[PDB]
Amino acid sequence: TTYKLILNLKQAKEEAIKELVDAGIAEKYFKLIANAKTVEGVWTYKDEIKTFTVTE
């Protein structure tokens, strides 16, 4: 909701899915960020993106 109400915070999920789609992580691209409730939830997922990006 938060990031849905404020366009300045909407950009958060956009950068989040940017990192995912650049990393080639479709699973989380569609699931992880789509399951965001707030921009803080997105910011939490931001760290998760790096977790899913690093596999080695």
Contact between residue 13 and residue 33 where contact means Cβ atoms under 8 Å apart: yes
Experimental method: NMR
Based on the structure, what is the number of domains in the chain?
1
Written as one letter, the residue type at 54 is V
Cβ neighbours of 54 (radius 10 Å): 8
DSSP H helical ranges for 1-56: 2-5, 7-23, 26-30, 39-53
CATH code of the domain in which 51 resides: 1.10.8.40
The residue segments making up the domain with residue 18 are: 1-56
Structure tokens at 12: 């958060």
